[PDB]
Amino acid sequence: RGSHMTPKDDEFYQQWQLKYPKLILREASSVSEELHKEVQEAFLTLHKHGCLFRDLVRIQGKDLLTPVSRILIGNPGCTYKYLNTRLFTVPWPVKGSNITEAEIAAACETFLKLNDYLQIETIQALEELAAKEKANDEVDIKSRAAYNVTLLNFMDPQKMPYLKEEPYFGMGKMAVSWHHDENLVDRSAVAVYSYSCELEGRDPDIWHVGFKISWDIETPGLAIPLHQGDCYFMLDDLNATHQHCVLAGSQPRFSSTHRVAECSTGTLDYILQRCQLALQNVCDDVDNDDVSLKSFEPAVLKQGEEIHNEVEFEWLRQFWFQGNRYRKCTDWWCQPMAQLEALWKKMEGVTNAVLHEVKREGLPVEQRNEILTAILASLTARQNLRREWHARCQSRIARTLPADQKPECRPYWEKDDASMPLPFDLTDIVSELRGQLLEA
Template identity: 40%
Template sequence: MFKRKHHSTDSSEEEEVKRRKREKKQRLIQDLQRQREFFLPWCQRYEQVVEESYSNFVLQQKDDITSALHGRIQWAFETLRDHGYLYQDRVKINKKTITTPVSRTLIGEPGLTYKYLNLRLFTLPWSFAGRPPSNDIEEACSVFRELNNYFCEQSKLLMVKKLAGRSRSEQTVEQETEDLVAGENNNYTDMSTASGKSTQEEDDNNVIERNSNFNITLLNYMDPSDVYLKDEPYYGMGRLAVSWHSDENLLEGSTVAVYNHTCYSARPEQDEDWKVGLKVAWNTEIPAILTPVCDGQCYYMLDTMNDTHLHCVLAGSTPRFSSTHRLTKCTSLSDIQKKSQRALENLNKNENGCVSLMSLDLGVIQFSEEIHDEVEFEWLRQFWMQGAKHSQEREYWIQPMEELESQWRQMELMTKLTVNAAMEEKNKSLIQKLLCIFTKRQSLRDHWMNRFSGRDICQIPSEHTPDYRPYWTDRDDTYPLPFDLADIMQQLESIEEEPY
């Protein structure tokens, strides 16, 4: 395949940055392995270390939630699992295909997405355009909206108390918390109409707002007897269900709230608890903590904790569900629809059906082609690549994805018109721009077409077999441009190399 020539300077600089990161990580690992200090709740220093370095971690007891809500949540977990809605993802890490040991699904506001490990997850909606749930799956999803509402209220209480406690006595904090919940304190409850407030009060309002709104939950399920789990490598904490990480693609400084449901065995007195580990990111001096989380308990990582700390999950002896509520900052369906419409504003159609471009300005072309790539690689391929079962479960998404694909075809036509104009006018600036765009696009297409090896495909269940959409052959003239852009790139480069 034709490959665009390029300078190696950028590549060598990137390699140097990666090398330094690897060295820094290796030094950190060595320091941690020498220290290996962490505390459990029954350790003498646990409370002191939590107060000093983990004050944004809050463990909530089971009795704080009604037994009726506990029952609905546990029914919802089991309903989604039993209907096959929780399954392991296949992701690429360091050019290797990895099957996640945890089974997951995303639930939330209609049209929202969440990305982790370069995989875009698409929500099962938890609300249904004003109508009640029509089946068990929709009912289960709506239960997590109920839990989400509860977490929003609790997170607000925790953040109000945290902010009020910075400089006031405990008695004053309790009274102000009650006033705020009752809506009697305008410092926090009416941002739009309050006047004369200090900058600090306005900042506090913003902090409370971002920490008391969740729009998605990522459901997790694991039966530790079904998967091989590695040991935690730094402290010797036990078997890792989820490795050390901070959650990706969340609004900076927003809370993460987690509901924990663990199943019981025939002999519950012998069950080993699941645990959550926490450590300060890029720090080898502050000890880590390890906290058991029992069935029905919740925990919160408040405010900036997800930005400044890492967490992991240590497996217990029985299956575990969790519902992890977040505020995603990923592009939504409405966002990409608006972007697509803006890109297509450069396509002119006259009364006779003839098409042309409104502008060949390089900035306009760059903008529309970036959206072209985003639609193809961040939406269409991400959605269809996850297989037939994934798309069938997300019926809500089918029509919007088909509409996006129709708009993407129009963007392909716009690219064709741009190529024609660049060749006819021998516009070398435009040709150089197109060569850069096509080099990236072809690389991304190759990546997606080769995301899974033949061996990987054989191990993927048929209902999750990737759908390489959109894909077409050179003989398919219903597409404006070929799938493989090598020939067009050669033609463009030959013009670029012609003398002035």
């Protein structure tokens, strides 16, 4: 049978060294009492103000509410995407940032302080790691520790008892199943501060993090006990070569999971830049509904429609699916999402202008068909993704969420809405374009 090891097992320490060396543990003792106090009060503050929410994610095609409640804190404008869900940062006061309620703002400051400390600890550990490997660059080390977000977790096993059994090693109840972390910079470290409020194998009353080798249930897994204020670090390629899970104890527990999000297509600045690139193809003297395009070159049109999808689905639908929970903690994304929606709306104008050109009496058919081939893939994806998002918004599990967390299918409009140049449902349009492309 599959098995696991804990500190109670004589082989635990040599197995940790042999098969899990890029896992590091810094016990609560190594962290100042002052910092423990601040961070723990910050967790409690965010809980009290109701800032942590179960996420309605998607896994193997199913809509699932995570047992764990979460909140993303981090650099202004940054996002972190996991399980098909793009989380938007509640901003921490990074330098040269401007300005959201007193206690919440203090809490985010605290997690930035914690971020600074864990970053220092991580750099030190990566230096020690390389030196160990020397017995056989500094910019890389710095970048692999440059945490830009933390994903905070909370779970009360007494209130959230509906937990699955760990299936391979007898590790008991899981708060989070076996996984690799998503959307991390390659070989970037993860630092976790773990805060638990107050036999054969691992103690069921105590929280652990479990590790196993990928693809491998023969090598016994490790279960690392996590007491109040213990920290652990996944270094270098550990996240790739191994999987981990979180094993529930009996008491409520928070954690702060500091990460280097791979946010190359995942910041507000990046997506604003994309929108601006798309709108370079629009005559921009005045903001009205008489949208006219500078070029119908296929490459340019394809690009514009791709950007249209990107802002629609990766930004707007993601944001509003989450029911503006952020707004409880911060108004930071309010103006940005209004601006992103206006940019998108102009892009609906653009699509209409391309459709109008395609129908233009004097357009030679060869040019028309070139345009159709340029845009069809994007419009097809737009239709399919609109169906998916609309259903994801209307799913049974979605409809049970409280009113302050209810998914909002947005943008959405009825065919009777004269403010929108095109219908929400593109079935007919896509069908017609396809048929045109096949005309003899």
